Amino acid sequence: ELELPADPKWELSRARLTLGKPLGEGAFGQVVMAEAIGIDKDRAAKPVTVAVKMLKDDATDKDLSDLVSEMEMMKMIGKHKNIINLLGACTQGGPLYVLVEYAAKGNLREFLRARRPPPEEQLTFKDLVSCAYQVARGMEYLASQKCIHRDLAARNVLVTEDNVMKIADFGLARDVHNLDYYKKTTNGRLPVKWMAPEALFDEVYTHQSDVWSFGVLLWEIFTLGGSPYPGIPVEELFKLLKEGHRMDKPANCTHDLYMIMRECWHAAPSQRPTFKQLVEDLDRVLTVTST
Amino acid sequence: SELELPADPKWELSRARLTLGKPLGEGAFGQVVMAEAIGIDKDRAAKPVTVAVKMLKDDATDKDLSDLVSEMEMMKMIGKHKNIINLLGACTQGGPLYVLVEYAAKGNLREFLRARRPPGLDPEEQLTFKDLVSCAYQVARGMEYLASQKCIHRDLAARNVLVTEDNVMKIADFGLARDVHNLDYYKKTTNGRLPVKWMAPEALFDEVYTHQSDVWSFGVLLWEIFTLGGSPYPGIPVEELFKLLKEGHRMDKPANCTHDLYMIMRECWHAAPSQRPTFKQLVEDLDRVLTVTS
Ligand SMILES: Nc1ncnc2c1ncn2[C@@H]1O[C@H](COP(=O)(O)OP(=O)(O)CP(=O)(O)O)[C@@H](O)[C@H]1O
Ligand SMILES: Nc1ncnc2c1ncn2[C@@H]1O[C@H](COP(=O)(O)OP(=O)(O)CP(=O)(O)O)[C@@H](O)[C@H]1O
């Protein structure tokens, strides 16, 4: 195997790490819950629960380069409260471990579907608006760092123990060289039901197309994890969107919130609001709302 | 461990007349660089010519050399045509192998079209409808010559069509170990890394490429031209494409595309490869559309 050169700013000794229960596995590799001691340099003995991204046994040379690419991307983007932040890395004396922040309550889609109205309590309208505001603030920071998510969705938003929203999978690598050449991998497909019409047509992703995806994410929040465009075949979605079709207003959703969804779904990408503007409009709705 | 090549004086150019310049693209087993060649123009000899040079990288193996030599010899065997990237010369003696091919200043066809769309709510050329038909007509004539010279392309797409300064369509990367038409067909290997969106279904199953499979690819290339560089099958994930094609799915007619051009496009996507039109028939079909535009 091959060990990456150590970065003294992020390198953590793997003897300070205790791997635990797995959190899931995918085409990238596998995420394992773990306990890290000394990840806080101010409290060198405080144990902190972290999520460890590593390669599975069936990992090739490209899977290693993709994991390193995601790690180096998180270093350059910087830290923000509403994103999954990098905490450390183990590059010496063993396989590559990428330590990120741990979200105890899973992804946002499962967080909403498990709390639908009839022992995990129940969310209010102000809770759903706050969830959208935190995601908007996270996307505002990513866009300021010229980061295009390309896959913004409720499944890619993680919820912490303190009910903090953190955007995940933002520093992933894309098919840069051979974009029109695919190899029989596993599964996962394209998030066509979250993609803007111009993104479906040209396979080009912008901050404006991320805004469209945020509108679909907003629709997931107030449907408590509903599936977008139910019953619409994948081969007819682009034609329907191009002809003006938009998803209806979800049940128990204010006029202001549905307008924000419709603004994100404007046919012209230049007319859609920016994430900075979305933060302001969601903040104003959050102030006049009270429970 | 000598790396010497046989002498072919009719194609040899003195490397003292070739000055290597800015890189144009680094592939996997090679690289292309811009260069200036003097005394090579067939009309005005004193006029230097900007060319593209195919050469090996610093870590190239002896098999990479054999591949580049084979591509050069394939360009010799196929011959010259206006609508392909032609061979101009080679530096094979007293130094590294330089394969000189024609230079296309305006890049590939996909980026050529995308950079010339109408303004989208936010100052170059403006392609008329007859310009798009002329673009498709030139690519068809290039494939007709390659098909007549026993050459299958296997990767016909807008990205593999280059545009010169004179807006001439030239098919590129046609000699990358691709030549089966003498008699019996020829299969390939397994694995992947292949353009699914441009491949015929029979080329996707048994992995055997024919001239009929290239015609399917040309149909997809027609869709790219009249969408001004759109990505094929919008909204269809790659994993679900082959199943939809078997069930009879075909792309919808592009916006502002004539019915006749859509019919030409649709017969390229005939399920039976025997029923697809030949490139000779495609040239006559496009030339008919080209003459009836007044
Ligand atoms: N940093 C983290 N903290 C807490 N949980 C995490 C986490 N990263 C991932 N998970 C959990 O692991 C699960 C799988 O995440 P993963 O990134 O592998 O998705 P995936 O690429 O395998 C496709 P899918 O989610 O549809 O299975 C997620 O549902 C999530 O709950
Ligand atoms: N004759 C020519 N004139 C002008 N540009 C050329 C050229 N030949 C190649 N190029 C450029 O050099 C690059 C070569 O492509 P590159 O090898 O880097 O990627 P690639 O491996 O995907 C080629 P392919 O898709 O055919 O396999 C391209 O960007 C192309 O535009």
Side-chain angles (χ1 to χ4, degrees):
Chain A
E1 300 192 4
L2 181 64
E3 289 181 343
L4 287 313
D7 195 339
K9 320 159 190 175
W10 300 94
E11 186 71 25
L12 180 76
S13 181
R14 63 178 66 253
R16 313 168 192 170
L17 184 68
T18 303
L19 298 176
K21 54 172 296 181
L23 297 177
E25 67 190 27
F28 316 96
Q30 49 177 336
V31 180
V32 182
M33 179 180 177
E35 182 185 39
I37 300 178
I39 208 66
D40 182 14
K41 299 174 182 176
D42 181 68
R43 320 239 285 101
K46 182 183 63 177
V48 178
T49 300
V50 301
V52 184
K53 302 171 65 65
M54 69 183 66
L55 299 179
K56 46 193 175 184
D57 297 333
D58 313 74
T60 64
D61 210 328
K62 185 200 173 186
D63 291 355
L64 189 272
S65 61
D66 287 359
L67 180 53
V68 176
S69 175
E70 181 183 10
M71 176 185 61
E72 298 297 322
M73 185 63 60
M74 302 177 68
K75 299 180 180 181
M76 299 180 179
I77 289 180
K79 283 186 173 300
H80 190 271
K81 180 183 179 183
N82 299 117
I83 65 176
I84 292 293
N85 294 285
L86 179 66
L87 301 179
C90 306
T91 64
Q92 307 290 318
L96 172 62
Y97 292 164
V98 183
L99 316 183
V100 300
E101 290 177 317
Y102 168 70
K105 297 185 178 182
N107 64 87
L108 170 55
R109 169 178 156 82
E110 305 288 353
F111 177 84
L112 296 168
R113 297 184 60 88
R115 292 162 181 80
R116 288 187 171 183
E120 26 227 3
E121 295 188 59
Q122 197 183 179
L123 310 123
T124 67
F125 183 82
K126 191 172 181 298
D127 300 359
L128 301 181
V129 181
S130 178
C131 285
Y133 172 80
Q134 300 182 46
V135 176
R137 289 237 304 176
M139 291 302 301
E140 184 187 18
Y141 175 82
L142 289 178
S144 72
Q145 307 304 307
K146 301 190 175 185
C147 171
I148 302 177
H149 195 293
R150 303 182 171 85
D151 202 343
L152 181 57
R155 58 183 177 272
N156 289 327
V157 175
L158 301 188
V159 189
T160 70
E161 234 300 296
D162 299 1
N163 302 327
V164 182
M165 318 310 286
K166 290 180 172 297
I167 303 165
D169 289 0
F170 56 88
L172 293 181
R174 330 295 176 180
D175 304 76
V176 282
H177 215 258
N178 295 122
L179 71 158
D180 304 322
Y181 307 83
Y182 105 109
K183 214 165 109 146
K184 258 106 168 193
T185 41
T186 312
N187 252 329
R189 313 192 193 105
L190 255 188
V192 291
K193 299 200 168 181
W194 283 257
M195 289 171 59
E198 74 276 7
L200 294 169
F201 191 76
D202 290 324
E203 282 180 313
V204 178
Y205 302 88
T206 64
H207 299 294
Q208 291 77 11
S209 60
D210 280 355
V211 167
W212 178 289
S213 305
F214 178 80
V216 184
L217 188 148
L218 249 183
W219 189 89
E220 305 182 74
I221 293 176
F222 291 89
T223 54
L224 298 179
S227 64
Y229 312 99
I232 292 181
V234 107
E235 63 272 23
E236 304 171 15
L237 178 59
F238 170 79
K239 190 173 188 299
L240 293 178
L241 294 179
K242 198 67 180 180
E243 290 175 352
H245 171 70
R246 298 297 185 272
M247 286 188 292
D248 302 331
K249 187 175 70 64
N252 195 266
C253 181
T254 58
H255 177 261
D256 302 297
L257 263 306
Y258 185 56
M259 289 299 102
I260 300 178
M261 304 178 186
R262 295 296 296 262
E263 288 191 4
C264 299
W265 297 336
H266 197 290
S270 64
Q271 307 307 103
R272 297 168 195 161
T274 63
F275 281 117
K276 176 187 178 63
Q277 179 62 31
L278 291 170
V279 167
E280 303 180 13
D281 299 311
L282 289 171
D283 190 26
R284 291 194 291 98
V285 175
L286 199 53
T287 58
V288 315
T289 308
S290 207
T291 58
Chain B
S1 183
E2 269 283 352
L3 277 74
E4 44 176 288
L5 301 180
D8 194 3
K10 59 182 180 179
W11 287 98
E12 188 72 17
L13 175 70
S14 174
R15 54 184 74 254
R17 303 187 183 185
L18 184 70
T19 307
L20 305 177
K22 195 70 173 59
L24 283 176
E26 195 181 290
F29 298 149
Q31 58 172 346
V32 187
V33 72
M34 193 183 309
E36 200 187 305
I38 59 180
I40 199 56
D41 196 314
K42 62 206 306 96
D43 289 356
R44 196 176 189 273
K47 179 179 181 179
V49 178
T50 299
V51 303
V53 176
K54 294 186 175 182
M55 60 180 58
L56 298 176
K57 299 188 297 183
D58 62 83
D59 61 327
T61 61
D62 68 328
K63 206 272 183 301
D64 299 321
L65 177 61
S66 301
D67 296 356
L68 183 57
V69 171
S70 63
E71 184 186 1
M72 175 187 60
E73 298 294 326
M74 185 60 60
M75 299 177 70
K76 297 182 180 179
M77 190 70 60
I78 292 178
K80 299 180 81 285
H81 192 265
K82 182 184 181 61
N83 296 118
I84 64 178
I85 295 292
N86 295 283
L87 177 68
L88 300 178
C91 303
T92 70
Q93 310 294 319
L97 174 59
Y98 297 160
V99 182
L100 286 76
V101 305
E102 289 173 315
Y103 169 74
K106 297 187 177 181
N108 68 82
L109 180 54
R110 194 185 85 164
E111 307 308 317
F112 181 89
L113 300 167
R114 290 184 174 187
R116 288 163 179 80
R117 292 178 174 176
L121 296 87
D122 288 78
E124 214 177 5
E125 286 174 285
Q126 189 74 5
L127 297 178
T128 62
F129 191 82
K130 190 174 182 177
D131 292 329
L132 296 178
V133 182
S134 178
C135 288
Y137 172 81
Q138 296 174 46
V139 181
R141 292 200 58 175
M143 287 304 299
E144 179 190 18
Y145 181 81
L146 293 177
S148 68
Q149 298 301 135
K150 299 94 183 177
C151 173
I152 310 178
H153 196 291
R154 304 188 198 178
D155 205 315
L156 183 52
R159 63 180 176 276
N160 287 324
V161 179
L162 304 179
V163 186
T164 69
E165 261 297 324
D166 299 329
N167 299 327
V168 177
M169 307 297 131
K170 281 179 160 53
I171 303 167
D173 293 353
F174 57 88
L176 275 61
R178 292 152 181 178
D179 190 300
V180 179
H181 175 260
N182 298 72
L183 212 157
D184 316 83
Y185 286 165
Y186 159 78
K187 307 90 106 300
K188 207 194 175 183
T189 179
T190 59
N191 208 240
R193 278 187 58 259
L194 70 181
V196 44
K197 287 187 175 183
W198 285 262
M199 290 170 57
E202 75 278 6
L204 234 172
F205 192 84
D206 8 286
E207 200 117 326
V208 38
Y209 305 89
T210 58
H211 293 287
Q212 298 81 39
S213 60
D214 280 359
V215 172
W216 180 289
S217 302
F218 180 79
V220 179
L221 190 148
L222 290 181
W223 189 90
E224 303 185 80
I225 292 184
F226 296 95
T227 57
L228 298 184
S231 185
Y233 305 96
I236 298 180
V238 160
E239 295 76 21
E240 294 168 86
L241 177 58
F242 183 77
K243 183 178 184 300
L244 287 173
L245 289 180
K246 279 185 54 185
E247 296 174 345
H249 168 75
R250 298 295 187 269
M251 277 188 283
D252 296 319
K253 187 177 67 60
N256 297 276
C257 179
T258 61
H259 183 261
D260 297 332
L261 281 166
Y262 186 55
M263 298 296 98
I264 299 175
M265 191 183 307
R266 286 292 302 275
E267 57 180 0
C268 293
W269 302 332
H270 199 294
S274 311
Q275 306 304 130
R276 302 169 192 166
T278 67
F279 285 113
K280 189 179 191 303
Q281 296 175 337
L282 287 172
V283 171
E284 307 186 71
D285 291 339
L286 291 174
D287 183 76
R288 186 197 63 87
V289 182
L290 196 61
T291 58
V292 191
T293 45
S294 58

